[PDB]
Every structure is written in C-alpha cells, then in structure tokens.
Amino acid sequence: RTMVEKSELWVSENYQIVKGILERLNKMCGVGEQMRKKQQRLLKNMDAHKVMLDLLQIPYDKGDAKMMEILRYTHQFLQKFCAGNPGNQALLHKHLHLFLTPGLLEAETMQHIFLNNYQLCSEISEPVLQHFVHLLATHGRHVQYLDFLHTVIKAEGKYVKKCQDMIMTELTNAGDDVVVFYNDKASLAHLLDMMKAARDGVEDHSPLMYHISLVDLLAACAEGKNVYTEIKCTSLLPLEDVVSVVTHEDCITEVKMAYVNFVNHCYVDTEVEMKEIYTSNHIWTLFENFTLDMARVCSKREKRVADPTLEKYVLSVVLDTINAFFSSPFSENSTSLQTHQTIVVQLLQSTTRLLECPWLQQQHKGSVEACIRTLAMVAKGRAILLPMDLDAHISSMLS
C-alpha cells in the first residue's frame, strides 16, 4: 500500500520486490478449502482488496512487458479472493466499474466475480452486458467474453430469464462479427478444413473453440422453455445445417455434442410446435447417426479402448434428445411418426444392448433406462413390430 501510494518511481529496484510480494501473496492465499476460507476472511478484515485495486488504477504506459506481469498476478489474487465467498464477490462488485475496460485478463476476474452468485447474476445491469457484447463485436472474437456471458445465464442451477432474453436480443443484432456461423457450402467447407486439423483435439483459443462456445451459449440461453429466444435462435442455425454437420463422417465429438444440445434445447424441448422437426425427414437421420455412434462406442469398448469425449456425448446429450423427442405433448400425435418405425426399433435395440454391457456406471444408467422406457411406450402406441428376443428382453423390465 505504501509503495502504491507512491508509484511514480516504478511507473528496477521497485519491480523485483513487487513481483516477489505478489507471488508470495498468491502462493499462501489458498490451501485446500478451509485454509482458503480462513485466509480469505483474514485478508478481507485487513482490507487487502482496496490495496490490490489501487495498484490496478496506476497510470501506466501501453507497452512495458515487465510491469504487465505484476497485473498478471494482482488479478489472480483477486480471483482467489472470491472463490466460494459470495461476500467477497459483493464487496468487489461495488467497484465493478474498474473492470469495464478492454482486455482479456480482466475478463477472467469478471467471470469469477459473478461465478455461482445468483443474487448478482439476476441483478446484472444492462451496461455490463452491452459492454461485453460491443467488446466481442469490435475488439474481436474471444472465448473469454463468451464464457462470461455463459456463466451469468445460470447461477446456482436456476436460470436467469432476464439475462437469457437480453443476451439473445443483443447477440442477434450483430452478425458476421459476433455470431459467426458456417451454414453456406463455402462456409461449411472452411469449417471442415479447420476441423480436420483438430482430429487429435481442439486447440484452446482457436476459432473452433469460439464456435463451440457460441453454440453452447446459444443453446443454454434457450434452456428455459422460452418462447422468444427459442424462435429467434431457430433462424440463425437451421435444422438442415445441424443435420449436415452432425452426420458428416469426419466429425469430432465436440461439435457433434454442441449441435445435439442445440437441437435438444432449442428444437425438441420447446414451448411451441416447430414444423421442421416433426413434419420432415431430418431428425431421423440424426437418430441413424446416434445408432451408428452407439455401435461405434460398443466396438471401441470391446477393443479395450475408449474416448471420454465420445462416452460423454453418447451418454449425456443423445439420450436426453431421444427422451425429449419421444416424451413431448406434440409427439404423442405421431402424425408423421407412423411412417417411420424401423428407426424406433433400431434405437430400442441399441439402447438395450448398451444397457446389457456391464461397464455402464450407475450414475448415467438411469438416462439409458428412461430412454428405453420411453421407446417402449412409443412402440406400444404405434403398434410397431417387435422382434421375439428383443420383445422378451424388454418385457423382462417393462413390469
């Protein structure tokens, strides 16, 4: 604090001490979970936050390459000052204006301030969201801003309807700079080209990561049975492009999971009827691809190998999508479901075979069982032919 009050000298001797002090403070600030709470309370009592914030306000030159590292530690300290401490988040939320500056390091601290704090996320003022959206539009396309936008939507499990609606209203306004999508043939080819270099894994901060985060945010903001955001987001990403990008042979699990989540929360789980989903032969190709993925996962496990991303994709989003499609008020009508019956039997047999495998952990076995149950109810109403062995195996668990 004394040095910060007189920062003109260093803004050589007054740099090493600063970096050492910051490194020590960051190192001893957090240990385990209870020592972390004790240190947080102790630092709050002696007002370390005011000192740390004051050091951030020092007028500095655009390019130093030495003092910048100091700010690379200061912010980190503030990140550990609020971990699981809503009081600390409220304390530094009063001075939030200091963090409304272009940059990437400040974005992480801003995200951590609003992390798992419903009282703040639900009361976030419009200027913060506008600032972040305009930074995304003008400054550039970065994943930190998308992460901040995402964390504020869902806090403590509950979804913030106001933020969900406003983020949609302001994101769709800017196009080709913020909401970048690859729907055209040339754009699809470019997307495939960039993806092909990520077969071994999606590089962090790459444009593919930005696209995945954007799709995830778009799906999440409509995860409230909303009628305004759901219809608004349907035009930007049509079902045709979703199916085309999900059914491609050279497709990684991340984009497939993102698209399946989008078509589950924005298309299937909806408050109003969508013509394309039911009165079109689009979701059935997705179901065929789901069966193919199930068979591929079974074969991979049989080969004493496994891909955790593929396991998560096949056990989290596909099952939820299948359950939602076959467990909706508009699906029991089966105006077009009568024409297609073989796909239902294929899905049922694939799901029951997946259950038959012993490696299925108990936590996610309930979703598979629920999918089988829903398919059984659909089959009973639809009067679809059932194989003898499959029928007996299903009836073993029906009652």
């Binding site: 305009h134 003008t138 080709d176 055209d184 049509p238 079902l239």
Partner: protein
C-alpha cells in the same frame, strides 16, 4: 474570404493519409469513401454533385430514440411516443429555421447533411468499421441520431476555440459520442476501384472546408450553379434531349404525341447548369453577364457547337467540358432588373461565346430511316431570332433524388442478377437484395414505412412518375432477371416450401408484389409486364403470389386481354390442369 454560416453548402477535402474529396458510393449504399484519383482542389471531380454537404445546427433525438427503443421491444404508450417524436421533429425543424444563417464557431456542434441523398453523416461507436477493425464505422442515416453530432475543432494553433470559422480553413471533425476524429484510411474497397474507406479513429487528418454556396444564395427563386433544369423550345413545343442514335451521342428535339407538351418529361431531357467561376469549387447564383455550361445528367457530356458536316454549326455533345467551346451565354427575352440574378422559369436565348452565334431549331430530322422520325436537328446561326428562345424549367430536387435512387437500385439489382446467373450468392448479398426489394415496394407504393407488412400494402392512388421511372430505368428488366435466373438448379419451385428456401420465397414474393404495384393504372407498364405472360404462367401453382399479379394484370383490360392472350397461353392452362387436375385452373 467569408465566415462559415449555418445552411451553407460546402465540400470537404481530406489531406491526411490520402488526399481527396469525400463522397458516397451511391444513394442506395450508406458507405462513404474518398477517391484521390477522382480530382483535387485545382481540378474538382466531375461528379461534384456527389461531394456537397450542408451545415445544420444541433437537433434533438431523445424522444425519437425512446420511440425507436419502444418499437424494438402498451398501444397507447406507443402512440404517445409517436406523437412525442412528431412534436420533437417539428421543434427541430422550427429551431433549424430559427438558427439559419448564424456563424459557426470553433468547438460548436454541427451536423453534415448530404445534399444528393439527404442523409446525415453518422458515426456508430458500437459497430466497428468494415475494412478497419480497430476503427469505428461511419455511415449515412436519413433520419439521423445522436451519432451525427460533431465538433468542428481547430486544426491550426493560430485558431482557438470560440473563434469564427473562416472558409478555406483546415479543421478537425470530432464526433461527440465516439470522440475519435474522422480518418481517410488507406484501406481500399474491393468492389470499387480507387475508393478508400473513411472511419472514426485517432489520426492527423485535416478537413479543408471549401465553400460552394452561401446560405443567402440558397433560394429556389433564382437560377444557380449545379441546378437540374430542362430546356423547352416554346416555338416548337419540344424538349431538348440527348441520346445515342446509332453509335454516337446526338442532341436533338424529341416529338411527343401527348396533348400537353410540358407533360412530356423524360430522364434524358435533364440537364445540369454550371456557372463559370474563377474558383473551380465555387458555384452560387448565376448572372446574365456570367457564362454558363450545360452538362448531360444521364451521360455527363457537355453541350457544344462543332463545324457542320454540310446551319453553319451543329449542337453536339462532347466528353470534356474544360474546352472553351462548351461555353454559352444567356440573352433575356424580356426586360430585366439591372442585370440582376436570372429568375427561375425564365425564357432565355442561348448564344455560343466562341462563335458568337445564336441557337436555332431546324426542321430537318435526324432519323429519316425510322418510320416516324422524332429527332429534330439544331444549329447555331449568326443571326438572332426572337422566336427561337429556350425556356429553362426547373426540376424539383425530389424528382432528381428519386431518379438517382432508381438508377442505383437498377445497378445493384443488375449486379445481383449477375451473381445469381453465376450460380453462387452470398447470404449478405441476398439480404441486401431483399432489403432493396422492400425499399422498392415502398417506393412504388408511395406509402411511408411504419412497420407495415411489405407483402400487404394497398395504395389509394398510384404515382405515375414512379411507375414511369421503374419502366424507364430498366428496374422491371432486372426484376424479371431475378425471377428467371434462380429457377433456370440453384433453386426449384417445388422446393420453395422448404425452410432453407424461405428467404428465396420472400424475395420472389417481393418481386411479384413490385410487378403488381408497378402496373396499376398504367397501359405501357401493363403491356411491358404482360410481355412475360409465359414466364408468369410457368410459376403458377406455388406460393409466390404470381396468381394475384396475373389476375390484376388481366382484370378489366379488354385490349390487353385480346393482345396478350394467344393459343399458347390457353394450351399452357390446359396442360397445367391436366398435370394437376386442379379446379383452380378451371376457375
């Protein structure tokens, strides 16, 4: 040297990274660019009408901004907001009229209004510039908003805040909201060659204010440089026209069968009057003593006199007006007030300065080969005839703006047609095409855009001028091209119902609505559209609103029905009903 005043017409010449005049690409396009190769201070650009701005006082947009916000996201509240916006607009108009002529001082707030497009220059901090990312976009908005406010700050230390601005002084234009001075960047537009983007970003650019017209001289009761006028021969009751006869441009008098000669108004008959001045960038009100030049608005050529091939001299069009031959002088046909300003709608006699010969109209036609020649020759003769006088009839600025908008729309529509023919169209290009189609629908309908559905618009009385503009400027041809090219692989009529093709369906419906609106109460447009009856028939049976257009075209038109229905049309109807067995075709 004179002080800058509110209402003066001036042109800005950037002299920073790139030196040149600031202009706009077109009326339909909101981008503003600088073209260094177009011209300089010594030699102003040929299309100087596109580089003229007017200084206007500060305006209030708070109530309008609230109304727009309400529209973006109760009925009584919306009506109250609309009324408040109307009162705010009236108050702004009254204040602007009141502050007319006041001197502009450094550090004050001014607005720049583009004369050709009647749109305020605006800076949007939220949206970055297209070519330059770190900079802020600059565009043109017809209504305007708080982004149009600018500070005319000094560029020379010898000038200080609070001092009167003097014509010819270099200044800095700092937007009030964005806060970053305008900059003529070096980024070059891909579509347009030689044009550099203008964007809001920190720089050292200096804007030189060149005065084109004073606030006092800006009145509609006097002839002024840059004015658009028509030359009417009272004795022959014909309008001067310039057109390509076989392969060369010729100037003639056209023959009209209309009962009223004055009613025979055409775009080719428009001319622009340029007052000869020592300063190339200065116009102003003209004088009887002062010399004049006439420029063809459509082609850009200048009227001149050349040796007669065989009536000693011939009136013709030349590419460059810098030549002394283009000079002309006016002689009053009646008494004048001490050689005062030339009054509007005043009969005059044109004489060639170089040859000292007076214009005259000859009865020898130029198109004898044609069945009904309509082009009459002109020439300069030494003698002066009082009967041979040309009246200069003024054209309203609104008509010129409408013509420019029609030309720009036709150009962009032809570009879109070429893109569709190539087989690939970008999403942004398709959105621009749809927006232009909606704008054209509103243009022909002559109904203000108040959020009403474009596909559902009814007109109490059609505007004949707008329909004639649409037919003459080839907008209908481009509309037919758009209706033909996609269907003729890229898109299929049967697949139009697909959601992926929904924008295409909207575009086709907009085109058909434009066709329906254009032909209402107009024989020539009705025949021109009916010439594509086969194409219109081929598209029947799909949700493209073609049936409504066909019904409107063939409704209560006996002569049109007789002429434009043949055996092939009935055969097509029979084939369609056979293919579908649809009773609607029997109806």
């Amino acid at each position: 040297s004179s002080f800058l005043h509110i209402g003066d017409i001036v042109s800005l010449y950037a002299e920073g990274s790139v030196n040149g005049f600031i202009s706009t690409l077109g009326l339909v396009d909101d981008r503003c660019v600088v073209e260094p190769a177009a011209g300089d201070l010594d030699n102003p650009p040929k299309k100087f009408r596109d580089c003229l701005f007017k200084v206007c006082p500060m305006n209030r947009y708070s109530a309008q901004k609230q109304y727009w916000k309400a529209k973006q996201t109760d009925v009584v509240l919306l009506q109250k907001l609309q009324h408040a916006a109307q009162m705010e607009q009236k108050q702004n108009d009254t204040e602007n009229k009141k502050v007319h002529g006041d001197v502009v001082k450094y550090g004050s707030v001014i607005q720049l209004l583009h004369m050709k497009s009647n749109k305020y220059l605006t800076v949007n901090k939220r949206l970055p510039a297209l070519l330059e990312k770190n900079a802020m976009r600059v565009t043109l908005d017809a209504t305007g908003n708080e982004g149009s406010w600018l500070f005319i700050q000094p560029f020379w230390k010898l000038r200080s805040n609070g001092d009167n601005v003097v014509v010819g002084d270099k200044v800095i234009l700092n937007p009030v909201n964005a806060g970053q001075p305008l900059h003529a960047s070096n980024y070059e537009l891909s579509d347009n060659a030689g044009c550099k983007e203008v964007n809001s970003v920190n720089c050292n650019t200096s804007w030189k204010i060149n005065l084109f017209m004073q606030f006092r001289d800006h009145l509609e009761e006097v002839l002024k440089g840059g004015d658009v006028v028509r030359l009417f021969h009272a004795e022959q009751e014909k309008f001067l026209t310039c057109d390509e006869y076989k392969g060369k441009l010729q100037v003639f008098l056209r023959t009209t069968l209309r009962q009223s000669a004055t009613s025979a108004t055409s775009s080719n008959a428009l001319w622009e009057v340029e007052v000869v001045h020592h300063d190339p960038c200065r116009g102003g009100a003209g004088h009887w003593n002062g010399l004049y030049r006439f420029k063809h608005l459509a082609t850009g050529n200048y009227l001149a006199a050349e040796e007669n091939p065989s009536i000693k001299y011939c009136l013709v069009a030349v590419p460059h007006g810098n030549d002394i031959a283009s000079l002309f002088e006016l002689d009053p046909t009646t008494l004048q007030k001490t050689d005062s300003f030339v009054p509007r709608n005043s009969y005059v006699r044109l004489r060639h300065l170089c040859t000292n010969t007076w214009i005259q109209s000859t009865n020898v036609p130029i198109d004898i080969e044609e069945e009904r020649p309509i082009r009459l020759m002109l020439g300069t003769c030494p003698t002066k005839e009082d009967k041979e006088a040309f009246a200069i009839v003024s054209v309203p600025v609104s008509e010129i703006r409408d013509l420019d908008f029609a030309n720009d729309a036709s150009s962009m529509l032809a570009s879109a047609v070429e893109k569709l023919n190539e087989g690939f169209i970008s999403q942004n290009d398709r959105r621009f095409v749809i927006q232009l189609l909606e704008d054209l629908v509103f243009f022909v309908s002559d109904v203000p855009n108040n959020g009403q559905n474009v596909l559902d618009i009814m007109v109490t009385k059609p505007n004949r001028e707008r329909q004639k503009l649409m037919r003459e400027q080839n907008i209908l041809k481009q509309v037919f091209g758009i209706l033909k090219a996609p269907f003729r692989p890229l898109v299929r009529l049967e697949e139009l119902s697909d959601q992926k093709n929904a924008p295409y369906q909207h575009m086709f419906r907009l085109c058909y609505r434009v066709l329906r609106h254009s032909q209402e109460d107009y024989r020539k447009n009705q025949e021109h559209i009916a010439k594509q009856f086969g194409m219109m028939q081929s598209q029947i049976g799909y949700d493209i609103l073609a049936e409504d257009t066909i019904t409107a075209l063939l409704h209560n038109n006996r002569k049109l029905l007789e002429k434009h229905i043949t055996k092939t049309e009935v055969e097509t109807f029979v084939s369609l009903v056979r293919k579908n067995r649809e009773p609607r075709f029997l109806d």
